[PDB]
């Protein structure tokens, strides 16, 4: 910096003097076995009946949930692994926002895990976008964008994602 100093976009007035194909960005994610993810839970005094299964991977569940009776249940999604809000980012702009999840639409590795709502890596999710403030031409204003999750939220609690723009 001494050697550099030795030698010698455009915005409005009110915005300067400030600072800040159809390929999805993850095609082909690693495949997950069904034997991992689904831990077995045995039931009885003699622990001798199996049949209950616990989803160990993270889950979006719904808005409207309620558990079902313990005798009728089976596919247990426990409440510590139930994400409501994801951490979405934009390829343009360079700003993340913490946005609420609205659905899980496409899950790789089978149509089971879409239907349980298992977030994984690679999964494509409906995001509520209203803090960003996107407007279609037509003039309607937007609050449903599909986003792809970028990390494995087993291995750290945060669900990150990138908007499919």
């Amino acid at each position: 910096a001494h050697e550099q100093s030795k030698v010698k976009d455009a915005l409005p007035t009110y915005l300067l003097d400030r600072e800040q194909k159809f390929s999805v960005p993850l095609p082909k994610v690693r495949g997950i076995s069904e034997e991992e993810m689904f831990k077995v839970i045995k039931t009885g005094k003699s622990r001798s009946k199996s049949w209950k299964r616990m989803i160990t991977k993270h889950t979006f569940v719904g808005e409207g949930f309620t558990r079902r009776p313990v005798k009728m249940e089976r596919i247990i999604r426990p409440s510590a692994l139930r994400q409501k809000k994801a951490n979405v980012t934009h390829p343009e702009l360079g700003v993340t926002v913490f946005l609420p999840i609205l659905a899980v639409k496409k899950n790789p590795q089978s149509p089971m895990y879409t239907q349980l709502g298992v977030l994984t890596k690679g999964t494509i999710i409906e995001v509520n976008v209203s803090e960003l403030g996107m407007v279609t031409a037509g003039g309607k204003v937007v609050w449903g964008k599909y986003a792809q999750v970028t990390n494995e939220p087993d291995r750290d609690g945060c669900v990150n994602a990138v908007l499919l723009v």
């Binding site: 194909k21 159809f22 390929s23 999805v24 993850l26 095609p27 082909k28 994610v29 808005e63 409207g64 609205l102 496409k106 790789p108 690679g122 494509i124 409906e126 509520n128 209203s130 803090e131 996107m134 279609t136 003039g139 309607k140 204003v141 937007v142 609050w143 449903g144 964008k145 599909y146 792809q148 499919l164 723009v165």
Partner: protein, 137 residues
Amino acid sequence: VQPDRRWFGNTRVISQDALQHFRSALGETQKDTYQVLLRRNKLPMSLLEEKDADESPKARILDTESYADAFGPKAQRKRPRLAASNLEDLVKATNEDITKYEEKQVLDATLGGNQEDKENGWTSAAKEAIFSKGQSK
């Protein structure tokens, strides 16, 4: 994940009339305790909310003066902001703030014991674990 014109496209969307319809209904509704909610309707709520406060947040001093300039060796801060108007108003603005202090000691006397036990030089007893129950994880 098979490439598709679906995605990138906008899924849900809302009408600019329908926002103006739903913003009014916060004003109207009215709960009724004999009624009870089954479903909610999926709605972009952050748009519909933000109602009119009349007060505002406090200003952000950190932007104008950091910390290093606010106090230190570096320290570029000769005079106070906002500072007083006049020395009549200063002496007015002391004498009530004295008596407001002198109140709170006479109040927190009558609230109390706690210091006088420490001057006498003894502590209050252990709270019994049964009064927890329960509580408990």
